Amino acid sequence: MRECISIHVGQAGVQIGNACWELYCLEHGIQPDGQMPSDDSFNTFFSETGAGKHVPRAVFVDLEPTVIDEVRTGTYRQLFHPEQLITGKEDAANNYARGHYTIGKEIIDLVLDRIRKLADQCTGLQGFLVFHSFGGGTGSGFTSLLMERLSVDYGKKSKLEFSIYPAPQVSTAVVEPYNSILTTHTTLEHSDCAFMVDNEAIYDICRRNLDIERPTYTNLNRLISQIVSSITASLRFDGALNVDLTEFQTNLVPYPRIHFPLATYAPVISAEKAYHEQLSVAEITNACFEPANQMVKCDPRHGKYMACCLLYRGDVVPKDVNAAIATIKTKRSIQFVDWCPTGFKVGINYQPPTVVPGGDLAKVQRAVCMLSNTTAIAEAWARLDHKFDLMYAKRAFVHWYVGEGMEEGEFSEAREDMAALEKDYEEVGV
Amino acid sequence: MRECISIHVGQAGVQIGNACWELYCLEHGIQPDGQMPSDDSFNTFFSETGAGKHVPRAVFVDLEPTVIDEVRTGTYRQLFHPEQLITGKEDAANNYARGHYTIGKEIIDLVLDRIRKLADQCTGLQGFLVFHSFGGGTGSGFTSLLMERLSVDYGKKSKLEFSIYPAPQVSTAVVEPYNSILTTHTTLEHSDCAFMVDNEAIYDICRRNLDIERPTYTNLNRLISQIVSSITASLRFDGALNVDLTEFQTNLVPYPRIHFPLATYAPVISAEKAYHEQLSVAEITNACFEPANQMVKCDPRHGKYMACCLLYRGDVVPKDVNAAIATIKTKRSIQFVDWCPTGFKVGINYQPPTVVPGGDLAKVQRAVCMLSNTTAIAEAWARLDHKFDLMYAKRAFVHWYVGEGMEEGEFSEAREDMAALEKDYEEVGV
Amino acid sequence: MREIVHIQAGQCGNQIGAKFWEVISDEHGIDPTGSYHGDSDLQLERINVYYNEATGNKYVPRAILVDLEPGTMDSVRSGPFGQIFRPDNFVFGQSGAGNNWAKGHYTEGAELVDSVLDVVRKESESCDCLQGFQLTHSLGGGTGSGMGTLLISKIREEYPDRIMNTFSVMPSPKVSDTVVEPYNATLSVHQLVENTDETYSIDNEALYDICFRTLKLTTPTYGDLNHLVSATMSGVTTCLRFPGQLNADLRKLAVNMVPFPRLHFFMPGFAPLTSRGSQQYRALTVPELTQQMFDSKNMMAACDPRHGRYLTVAAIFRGRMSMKEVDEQMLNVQNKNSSYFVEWIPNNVKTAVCDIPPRGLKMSATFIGNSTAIQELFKRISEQFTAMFRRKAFLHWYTGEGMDEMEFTEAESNMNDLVSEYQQYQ
Amino acid sequence: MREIVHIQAGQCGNQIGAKFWEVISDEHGIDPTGSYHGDSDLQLERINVYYNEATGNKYVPRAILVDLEPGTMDSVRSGPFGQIFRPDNFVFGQSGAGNNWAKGHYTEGAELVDSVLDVVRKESESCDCLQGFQLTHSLGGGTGSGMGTLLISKIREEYPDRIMNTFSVMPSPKVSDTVVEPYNATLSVHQLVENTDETYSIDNEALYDICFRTLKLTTPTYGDLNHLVSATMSGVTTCLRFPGQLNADLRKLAVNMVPFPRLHFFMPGFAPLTSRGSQQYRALTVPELTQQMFDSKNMMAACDPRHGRYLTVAAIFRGRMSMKEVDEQMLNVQNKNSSYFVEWIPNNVKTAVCDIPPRGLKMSATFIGNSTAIQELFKRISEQFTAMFRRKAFLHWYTGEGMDEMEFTEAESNMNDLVSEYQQYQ
Ligand SMILES: CC(=O)O[C@H]1C(=O)[C@@]2(C)[C@H]([C@H](OC(=O)c3ccccc3)[C@]3(O)C[C@H](OC(=O)[C@H](O)[C@@H](NC(=O)c4ccccc4)c4ccccc4)C(C)=C1C3(C)C)[C@]1(OC(C)=O)CO[C@@H]1C[C@@H]2O
Ligand SMILES: CC(=O)O[C@H]1C(=O)[C@@]2(C)[C@H]([C@H](OC(=O)c3ccccc3)[C@]3(O)C[C@H](OC(=O)[C@H](O)[C@@H](NC(=O)c4ccccc4)c4ccccc4)C(C)=C1C3(C)C)[C@]1(OC(C)=O)CO[C@@H]1C[C@@H]2O
Ligand SMILES: Nc1nc2c(ncn2[C@@H]2O[C@H](COP(=O)(O)OP(=O)(O)OP(=O)(O)O)[C@@H](O)[C@H]2O)c(=O)[nH]1
Ligand SMILES: Nc1nc2c(ncn2[C@@H]2O[C@H](COP(=O)(O)OP(=O)(O)OP(=O)(O)O)[C@@H](O)[C@H]2O)c(=O)[nH]1
Ligand SMILES: Nc1nc2c(ncn2[C@@H]2O[C@H](COP(=O)(O)OP(=O)(O)O)[C@@H](O)[C@H]2O)c(=O)[nH]1
Ligand SMILES: Nc1nc2c(ncn2[C@@H]2O[C@H](COP(=O)(O)OP(=O)(O)O)[C@@H](O)[C@H]2O)c(=O)[nH]1
Ligand SMILES: [Mg+2]
Ligand SMILES: [Mg+2]
């Protein structure tokens, strides 16, 4: 019942998985060895065997072994099914071309084989939680090949998309927009609701809120895990208003192509800071709409809200939710599209947030998960399109994509598709 | 209910805050850590969290960090919300110019942000208690920038002004009148009732009454705190005649521009001196009108009283107040304007004054707070205007103000405005 | 697993490669006799990248030592780590090349290319998954420049898909030790551009500039220049021998670093670099590593980057550090110095970070740069070639080997073509 | 946080700056090796103002040592605190200036200005929030007066907004040790007035007068004059390195102390000053500090303030004192001596108080004064210049360096202009 198969592609995907399962084993009380010391709250994410062992339903796919066989050496080496974590021989070279045609071709058939052997025990499979990065070669090419076959083998099943998106300023590779643009066909055609992750915005989040001067990506991971667990909170624990994963995405999505909502989490706050605040429902409600708390470097005040979903968890009373949202609709600075004078979807869960012992996040009795679609997010693509022009105008690095079996015009279809998406997110704002 | 947001700008403002909160935590019985060992008498000044902690609603703003990060090291480092005490990078250089256009520009937006996050928990916000110094660069420029935006974001809310005013003889900087004159537009347009503080007059007070030969500014602070607490006494404790903060300023103000009353406190007396006097209500009433007890070096006998407010606290019977004020109106040496044959506003509070353990003030069962507007105070500006001429006649230090983005004619508007104020306080005396 | 097969050409190549072998044997904790002596298991998983597993848990490097003289083989086998090498890969002639490119490419090295190919092929078949060939040689003289290009062409012909990265020490005007270097350099880069996927240009003069003006050595010998080369030698391949947060193997660099196929002669560099009496005072923080890294003094060629524009730069960091400051310096460098980086391509930097720093170092940074200013050495080599080309000196010692004038003309034309492309995008 | 970057020019400048470094290293409790050894944390928070944090919790001062001879560098590095300095900031030539301003400003120092600029820029970028540059030099001779003005002009050009304060020991008639000083002083103040926001004039004769007639030293050496300079050196920047009730950094002084932009040559002084056998008897109370402070004997130039009017005076007090007596003396001095202070500007004093007194002192007072009487040294320098200008001596040793007569004429005209402005408001 209510099972979800999590897919982890690329270095970013596999390591964000390492952090997510680190959070899940703690919140559901499983040791790193898979045992339960002493409700079926784990059936959503973990499978059970006769010996009392919790086996996650997850696949780690990387075209290179270093990160995954590092996982084979870490504390979670025995938690995972060893041959459901698949390693390739040749890295993706930050190239969508080989990852989509050349190197992922020989390995994808085993990946779908393991997906099938994960699906056949799920009696109530709810959806898919695939993790990757746009800029990475694996996270672009292999995901592009994989959602294609998943959409024809599991077409009815929902496919939530949690992807890591490049920053306006911070970047790790010059070819990142090339990998990002050929991913856009996958999210538009073979995804049901995509969640985009910006590293620089959350860098600002941890700089300002967590007061930590020197966090790593592991600190980024130990909050992406919270956002995904909060999205999955209603499926695993009891709540006064439990939101089904299908109910969720029906509430987000106004049109089949408009399914790209922003995400924010509250309260992101350090342990030294949690003490001096009462941390009411109202202020965590007010903090979410603050542009200084957005996960993507775009100003919501530059845009218009279409769908709003209040995913509260912990000791939160729905009356306080109504009182907060009355204030939210009271201010004019937050102007919603003329589509939704009802505005808000409310979801409340009884489980307080679970704290990572090595994390930088404080223990708070209340936590809220904010997921909202808005027209302001097109700016996060409005710099990437001008960016892609700035390379494609000479055919900057295409000889590699051409040399690995990509048609030259696939870039033309790519920027045509992103232009279509950018237009689609502008007409709905009128 | 009945909350007031206190603003502290400049070195003088932040340190007078350090003394005021030192007095408030003692009188309301809060430890320096914010806890209550064991009525909602603290709701006027302190906010409460779930863990039983009292958090003041105050902002320390200084364009330089030394005094505030000294507060971050003092005994009250944990009492205050650390990022509601805002520090800049560049000092104000005793210059209104940079403080009003250049250096305070980048920091004021955070200051109003924190003011908003202090306003949103105040359910019954009564007014603002901003502290600064006229002569200081920060206390002039940043306050001038701040009341401008507060008057448009909190226009209805009262804004009491407690400012430290230069002496006729004692001075610490040559540019002090320059900073003081550009402050006059703020008090006239963006203040509701300003309270002016002279260091030399209160130097004479502590020399004569406290018998202390060698006090510091901390002794000045441990009586400015008493005057402000006595003004706020009715809002926090019970009294037979409690005077609302709006009631107070309605009783002070005859005209929108005549809102500049003097202040005196009685009984200012040393511990060795408290023993030999019975200290009746009459003598503390008589001591307040004595020019040797005025807070500003101006002779009230040189001027005419318009509004009189008797803010008694402690074991005082209102009959004795009436008996005292009958004697006050009996003598001719105290001549009130033909506006107010009713003369006196009476306010009585049941809380005796709270003594600082390290202070130089005696413990007295009775205390009275004297606030009165009079035409004699124009002399405190009648030497500052002739003073400002004595510098502006060559353009003495204007190249700095010009060099930091001030219009040269802003001095012309400044002395035109002070001349208008000086005239306004003379016609009403006829 | 991504095995990498090393080839040494010329005395310069084999001695600097031998010192590289010494360095990475210390990094992997390999005894001079070949046995393992490292401390952590991290030195052990990717031994297959550079060494072959043998009986007794001893490890033999996958290196092919090629020369036309036995004296250099005698010195290297008698060197500090001579005993660890394969006796079979000591493939060598007897008569030297005499700094003659034609000798090495037609007569002296053509007879030994058969004896080097049967060794490189067996080394490659000994690999589980070959990634490429790292070849060390010198553009000066006729051994390293001469036979090196021939066997590079052969291995490229029979291995068309594997990565081809070469580290080339190349001639210079003021520290020239041989008269006939420019002929050798022009006849070598002709094949280097057409065949190699990667070429690192190393100039001796800037190595000297590093050891005096940064390292403050009074007598830095030739081995110190070898050390400076070997630092980046080990740095460029760090990601596929050790775990790190951002893994970037050779082809990861390649896909990010060479915008057009022929623009693959690059700028190596390494940080930190201090004198003996100044390391005690330096703060080794990553921002300081960066400010040292893009300095024109830290580079290993005379081509000053301020005379051109960077096409792509690769900064493979190493050590237990976070990375937001990494991004902030990598954007600040290209923002405040945007006039030194091609504005038309926005993010010129590839960032890689490794988790285990070098032994004795808390952190390290390896610099790889694509600047249009690298044409300074190419056009100067072409000009010096013209000063000894236009009216026929020294050609009897090439034409006597079957070499011909028109091939010299095409080599010069190709140098001019290269400098044309690299000035085109400046 | 308000970092301040120090530059030493000339032997006078670098030795007095070195002794200043010694003094404030003792104040901050810094070991000769550079490690911290202070007692309270108060010495530790504002270490960033003068020193750079490095590995091992040792601290290197932000000083750039500039000279045209290696002998002074040899002496300073072998001095008591030579080891704490940066080996890189020892930037120096070999041939000296020979007390020639033209040499330092055109030939000898122009080649080294590139090597000083790349160091001062790296020092400035190492700072978190730069406040200004404190530069020590001598108006005598051609090194300190010559290259000092050139590099001051350069740093002013590229740092237009930062505070520029210079402490200048300047020539004098009766204790003159070099023939050609007046040329140097006239060619130096020309740039000092136009570029510097702040200049402290120091005269050696009044230092001698202090050490005999107040300190009662029988043999006060040159280091004692350096000590007298360094006392005010440390005093003027006390407020931004330590807490005090009245904080007054350099720009706090500036906004209060220089009424018109060009009236920025000022009068330093320090109190208390006693002989060894008289400190036992003195009452160090603040009023006595004041009566000592405005004495004409306490000052460090021959310009007697009774021959002019004070424009602005700065009294940065230090120690655990109250301040009503501070105000009462600062008003009594300007009231009972109102004939010595410009009555047209009423409150001529800027008052600053620090909470931590100097080590071994319960309290201290630092004197900074703007008097129209400071023109005594300027007009006397102009007169001595005229006695060696009007009919052409020594000009061949300047004109041989590319120097020209008309620039000497403009320099003299500018000295006359300055003395005109300072006599105008007297
Ligand atoms: C006590 C102390 O801290 O001294 C350090 C050191 O950090 C200094 C002095 C070292 C030192 O290096 C040199 O003296 C040197 C001389 C000529 C050419 C190159 C280096 C050091 O020898 C080098 C050595 O570095 C390593 O061990 C690295 O792993 C390096 N391997 C070698 O240098 C090496 C030396 C002998 C045999 C085999 C290898 C390395 C660098 C990049 C990639 C792989 C390996 C270290 C930490 C030191 C000493 C010992 C003084 C420096 O070396 C490196 C490569 O980091 C020179 O500048 C750097 C940084 C420092 O100034
Ligand atoms: C036993 C005793 O009370 O002697 C005192 C002292 O007060 C006297 C003798 C000191 C003493 O100074 C001298 O003898 C001296 C000689 C030549 C030039 C200048 C000073 C003293 O050396 C100086 C020293 O002062 C300090 O330590 C200050 O912090 C000073 N630093 C130094 O003088 C210093 C000395 C060596 C190495 C590094 C610094 C300082 C002043 C201003 C700003 C920063 C630092 C003190 C208290 C004394 C002695 C030891 C005798 C005096 O010095 C100062 C600067 O206050 C000279 O006149 C003053 C006051 C006193 O007469
Ligand atoms: N937020 C976040 N982003 C990450 C993390 N790890 C990798 N990324 C993103 O991944 C992008 C680059 O992709 P890669 O590092 O190459 O990972 P990959 O998806 O496996 O791609 P390949 O290595 O080519 O196979 C970077 O721009 C990062 O934004 C992480 O831990 N947190
Ligand atoms: N009564 C009293 N006045 C004070 C106190 N502290 C400072 N002042 C006044 O402040 C005036 C000078 O302002 P500053 O000391 O520069 O303080 P500031 O307002 O922060 O101004 P800046 O330093 O330029 O930012 C003096 O003339 C004093 O009258 C105090 O503790 N008590
Ligand atoms: N950087 C460096 N350069 C060297 C070294 N040894 C020699 N060289 C120079 O590099 C050039 C290469 O020429 P060389 O290798 O002798 O020609 P070959 O014999 O035909 O291979 C020579 O002219 C030397 O001056 C070394 O150890 N390091
Ligand atoms: N106050 C003081 N004066 C000095 C000191 N040393 C030298 N002087 C004098 O200051 C003048 C400066 O000239 P100088 O520095 O030698 O010229 P430069 O070599 O071109 O920098 C000299 O004529 C000296 O007489 C010192 O330690 N303190
Ligand atoms: Mg990858
Ligand atoms: Mg201030």
Domain boundaries, chain D: 1-259, 260-373, 374-426
- Cβ distance D322 to B214 less than 8 Å, yes or no, reads yes
The answer on whether C11 is annotated among ligand-binding residues is: yes
| From C243, C327, C347, residue closest to A70, measured CB to CB | C243
Residue A141 in contact with residue A172, Cβ under 8 Å?
A: no
The CATH number corresponding to C260-373 among 3.90.950.20, 3.30.1330.20, 3.30.450.40, 3.40.640.10 equals 3.30.1330.20
What's the maximum distance between 2 C-alpha atoms anywhere in chain B?
64
- Cβ distance D55 to C291 less than 8 Å, yes or no, reads no
Which residue among C169, C170, C228, C230 is best mutated to probe the pocket of ligand 5, counting the most ligand atoms within 8 A of its Cβ? Answer: C169
What burial letters (b/e) apply to D170-183, b meaning 16+ CB within 10 Å?
Answer: bbbeeeeeeebbbb
Chain B residues touching residue A277 (CB < 8 angstroms): 49
Nearest ligand 2 atom to the CA of D274 is 62
**Residue A336's CATH number:** 3.30.1330.20
Chain C residues touching residue D114 (CB < 8 angstroms): none
Cα D105 from Cα C268, distance rounded (Å): 39
Report the SS3 class of residue B203.
helix
**Residue A10's CATH number:** 3.40.50.1440
Structure tokens at D366: 């630092």
| From D256, D259, D344, residue closest to B173, measured CB to CB | D256
Cα A194 from Cα A192, distance rounded (Å): 7
- Residue B378 CA to its chain's centroid (Å): 18
A146 and A63 part of one domain: yes
Q: What ligand is nearest to the CA atom of residue C366?
A: 1
Cα C12 from Cα C167, distance rounded (Å): 11
Residue D66 in contact with residue D92, Cβ under 8 Å?
A: yes
Return the residue matching tokens 């746009």: A134
B136 and B238 part of one domain: yes
Residue/partner pairs of A34-38 with CB below 8 Å, 24 or more apart: A34/A78, A34/A79
Q: Which amino acid belongs to residue A229? A: S
| From A65, A94, A217, residue closest to C252, measured CB to CB | A94
The contacts of residue D238 (CB under 8 Å, 6+ apart) are D244, D316, D318, D352, D354, D366
A223 and A273 part of one domain: no
Residue C299, φ and ψ in degrees, nearest 5: -80, 165
Residue A181, φ and ψ in degrees, nearest 5: -70, -35
Nearest-10 crossing angle of helices B10-27, B217-231: 60
Closest CA to C97 of C397, C388, C394, C392: C397
**Residue B394's CATH number:** 1.10.287.600
- Strand residues in A134-258 grouped as ranges (E): 158-165, 193-198
Cα B257 from Cα B246, distance rounded (Å): 16
Q: What ligand is nearest to the CA atom of residue D273?
A: 2
Nearest ligand 3 atom to the CA of C248 is 23
CB of B137 within 6 A of ligand 4: the answer is yes
What burial letters (b/e) apply to B31-48, b meaning 16+ CB within 10 Å?
Answer: eeebeeeeeeebbbbbbb
* Radius of gyration of the CA atoms of chain D, in A: 21
Cα C311 from Cα C345, distance rounded (Å): 8
Q: Which strand (E) or helix (H) includes residue A71?
A: helix A66-71
Q: Domain of A382?
A: 377-430
Mutation target among B15, B67, B91 for the D interface, most CBs of D within 10 A: B91
Residue B258 in contact with residue B427, Cβ under 8 Å?
A: no
Chain B residues touching residue A278 (CB < 8 angstroms): 48-50
- Cβ distance A276 to B50 less than 8 Å, yes or no, reads no
Q: SS3 helix, strand, coil % of chain B, rounded to 5?
A: 45, 20, 40
CATH 3.40.50.1440 fits C1-259, yes or no: yes
A213 and A294 part of one domain: no
Cα D7 from Cα C213, distance rounded (Å): 22
Q: Which strand (E) or helix (H) includes residue A427?
A: helix A410-427
Cα C262 from Cα C197, distance rounded (Å): 8
What residues pack around ion ligand 8 (CB closer than 5 A)? B 10-11, 138
Q: Which amino acid belongs to residue B342? A: T
What burial letters (b/e) apply to B129-148, b meaning 16+ CB within 10 Å?
Answer: bbbbbbbbbbbbbbbbbbbb
Residue D38, φ and ψ in degrees, nearest 5: -70, 170
Q: Which strand (E) or helix (H) includes residue D324?
A: helix D324-336
Sign of CA dihedral A272, A275, A276, A278: positive
| Vertex D176: Cα angle to D172 and D179 (nearest 5) | 115
CA-to-CA separations, B277 to B267, B274, B284, B365, in angstroms, rounded: 11, 6, 11, 12
Q: Which residues pair with D350 in a beta bridge?
A: D314
Last residue of a domain, one of B345, B376, B407: B376
Structure tokens at C78: 């008698």
**Taking the CB of residue B74, how many other CB atoms lie within 10 A of it?**
14
Residue D415 in contact with residue D120, Cβ under 8 Å?
A: no
Residue B134 in contact with residue B69, Cβ under 8 Å?
A: no
- Cβ distance C281 to D122 less than 8 Å, yes or no, reads no
- Cβ distance C351 to A175 less than 8 Å, yes or no, reads no
Which residue's CA is the nearest one to ligand 3's atom 13?
Answer: A136
Residue D142 in contact with residue D182, Cβ under 8 Å?
A: no
Cα C349 from Cα C341, distance rounded (Å): 10
Burial (CB count within 10 angstroms: exposed 0-12, middle 13-18, buried 19+), residue D232:
buried
Residue C201 in contact with residue C301, Cβ under 8 Å?
A: yes
CB of C26 within 6 A of ligand 1: the answer is yes
Numbers of helices and strands, H then E, in chain B = 16, 12
Q: Is the peptide bond before D70 cis (omega within 30 degrees of 0)?
A: no
Q: Which strand (E) or helix (H) includes residue A48?
A: strand A46-48
Closest CA to C285 of A173, A214, D36, D51: A214
B256 and B362 part of one domain: no
Residue D88, φ and ψ in degrees, nearest 5: -75, -35
The contacts of residue C196 (CB under 8 Å, 6+ apart) are C152, C156, C164, C165, C166, C264
Sign of CA dihedral A36, A42, A45, A51: positive
The contacts of residue D245 (CB under 8 Å, 6+ apart) are B216, B217, D323, D353, D355
Burial (CB count within 10 angstroms: exposed 0-12, middle 13-18, buried 19+), residue D296:
middle
By DSSP bridging, strand D198-203 and strand D265-271 are parallel
Q: Three-state secondary structure along A11-23?
A: HHHHHHHHHHHHH
Sign of CA dihedral B82, B86, B88, B91: negative
Cα A60 from Cα A65, distance rounded (Å): 10
CB of D373 within 6 A of ligand 2: the answer is no
- Cβ distance D1 to B91 less than 8 Å, yes or no, reads no
Q: Which amino acid belongs to residue A30? A: I
Which residue among B91, B133, B200 is best mutated to probe the pocket of ligand 4, counting the most ligand atoms within 8 A of its Cβ? Answer: B133
CB of D27 within 6 A of ligand 2: the answer is yes
The contacts of residue C160 (CB under 8 Å, 6+ apart) are none
Structural domain total, chain A = 3
Residue/partner pairs of A408-416 with CB below 8 Å, 24 or more apart: A410/A182, A411/A181, A411/A182, A413/A185, A414/A181, A414/A182, A414/A184, A414/A185, A414/A388, A415/A181, A415/A385, A415/A388, A415/A389
Residue D68 in contact with residue D92, Cβ under 8 Å?
A: yes
Cα A120 from Cα A115, distance rounded (Å): 9
Residue D170, φ and ψ in degrees, nearest 5: -130, 155
Cα A192 from Cα A151, distance rounded (Å): 10
B residues 370-399 closer than 8 Å to D (CB):
387, 390-391, 394, 396-397, 399
Q: Would you put residue A339 in left (φ > 0), alpha (ψ -120 to 50) or beta?
A: alpha
Whats the size of chain C, residue-wise?
Answer: 426
Cα B375 from Cα A375, distance rounded (Å): 61
Q: Could you say which DSSP state residue D402 is in?
A: T
Residue B7 in contact with residue B130, Cβ under 8 Å?
A: yes
Q: How far apart are the first and last CA of chain C?
A: 39
Nearest ligand 5 atom to the CA of C181 is 23
CA-to-CA separations, D57 to C362, D29, D34, D37, in angstroms, rounded: 16, 13, 9, 10
Report the SS3 class of residue D295.
coil
Return the residue matching tokens 């020991």: D169
The string of DSSP codes covering B264-308 is: EEET---HHHHTT----HHHHHHHHTSGGG-SSS--GGGS-EEEE
CA-to-CA separations, C258 to A160, A387, A397, B159, B303, in angstroms, rounded: 36, 19, 8, 65, 86
Cα A42 from Cα A28, distance rounded (Å): 7
Nearest ligand 1 atom to the CA of C278 is 62
**Taking the CB of residue B49, how many other CB atoms lie within 10 A of it?**
15
Sign of CA dihedral D3, D7, D12, D14: positive
Residue D202 in contact with residue D167, Cβ under 8 Å?
A: yes
Residue C171 in contact with residue C139, Cβ under 8 Å?
A: yes
Cα C422 from Cα C311, distance rounded (Å): 10
CB proximity D254 to B under 8 Å = yes
Residue D162 in contact with residue D28, Cβ under 8 Å?
A: no
Cα D44 from Cα A262, distance rounded (Å): 46
Q: Is the peptide bond before B32 cis (omega within 30 degrees of 0)?
A: no
A338 and A208 part of one domain: no
- Strand residues in B187-284 grouped as ranges (E): 193-198, 262-266
Closest CA to D80 of D31, D43, D39: D31
Structure tokens at B73: 């090291």
The contacts of residue A164 (CB under 8 Å, 6+ apart) are A12, A16, A132, A133, A134, A135, A139, A197, A199
The residues of A annotated with a catalytic role in the active site are 247
Last residue of a domain, one of A354, A376, A398: A376
Cα D186 from Cα B227, distance rounded (Å): 60
**Taking the CB of residue A407, how many other CB atoms lie within 10 A of it?**
10
Interface of B with A (CB under 8 A): 34, 48-51, 53, 55, 81, 120
Q: What ligand is nearest to the CA atom of residue B135?
A: 4
By DSSP bridging, strand A58-62 and strand A85-87 are parallel
Return the residue matching tokens 């709250």: A41
Q: Is the peptide bond before B352 cis (omega within 30 degrees of 0)?
A: no
The contacts of residue A275 (CB under 8 Å, 6+ apart) are B51, B53
CB proximity B173 to D under 8 Å = yes
Q: Which residues pair with D327 in a beta bridge?
A: none
Residue B129 in contact with residue B20, Cβ under 8 Å?
A: no
Report the SS3 class of residue A152.
helix
Q: Could you say which DSSP state residue A363 is in?
A: P
Closest CA to C133 of C47, C240, C8: C8
Cα D422 from Cα C286, distance rounded (Å): 52
Structure tokens at D201: 């004039």
Q: Which of B48, B90, B148, B247 is catalytic?
A: B247
Closest CA to A410 of A48, A100, A64: A100
CA-to-CA separations, B365 to B280, B317, B324, B355, in angstroms, rounded: 10, 12, 17, 11
B321 and B418 part of one domain: no
Q: How far apart are the first and last CA of chain A?
A: 42
- Cβ distance B49 to A286 less than 8 Å, yes or no, reads no
Which residue among C108, C138, C176, C201 is best mutated to probe the pocket of ligand 5, counting the most ligand atoms within 8 A of its Cβ? Answer: C138
CB of C235 within 6 A of ligand 1: the answer is yes
Which residue's CA is the nearest one to ligand 2's atom 3?
Answer: D360
Cα C43 from Cα C29, distance rounded (Å): 7
| Vertex B115: Cα angle to B112 and B117 (nearest 5) | 115
B404 and B282 part of one domain: no
Structure tokens at D116: 């000083």
Report the SS3 class of residue A371.
strand
- Cβ distance C275 to D88 less than 8 Å, yes or no, reads no
A272 and A372 part of one domain: yes
CA count, 13 A, side-chain hemisphere, B300: 28
Mutation target among D40, D44, D246, D255 for the B interface, most CBs of B within 10 A: D255
CA-to-CA separations, D357 to B427, C185, D23, D409, in angstroms, rounded: 53, 70, 14, 48
A319 and A383 part of one domain: no
Residue B112 in contact with residue B154, Cβ under 8 Å?
A: no
Residue C42 in contact with residue C242, Cβ under 8 Å?
A: yes
Chain B residues touching residue D350 (CB < 8 angstroms): 172-174
Cα A311 from Cα A369, distance rounded (Å): 5
B298 and B164 part of one domain: no
Closest CA to D252 of C155, C329, B92, C282: B92
Chain B residues touching residue A326 (CB < 8 angstroms): none
Alpha-carbon torsion angle B62, B139, D363, B360, nearest 10:
-100
Structure tokens at B404: 């930091």
Residue D61, φ and ψ in degrees, nearest 5: -65, 150
**Taking the CB of residue A242, how many other CB atoms lie within 10 A of it?**
16
Domain topology for C374-426? Helix Hairpins (1.10.287)
Whats the size of chain A, residue-wise?
Answer: 430
CA count, 13 A, side-chain hemisphere, B99: 28
Chain A residues touching residue B50 (CB < 8 angstroms): 278
A270 and A289 part of one domain: yes
CA count, 13 A, side-chain hemisphere, C314: 32
Residue A20 in contact with residue A224, Cβ under 8 Å?
A: yes
Last residue of a domain, one of B261, B295, B324: B261
The answer on whether C144 is annotated among ligand-binding residues is: yes
Q: Where are the alpha helices (DSSP H) in D103-249?
A: 113-125, 146-158, 181-195, 204-213, 222-236
Chain D residues touching residue C333 (CB < 8 angstroms): none
Report the SS3 class of residue D256.
helix
Elucidation method: cryo-EM
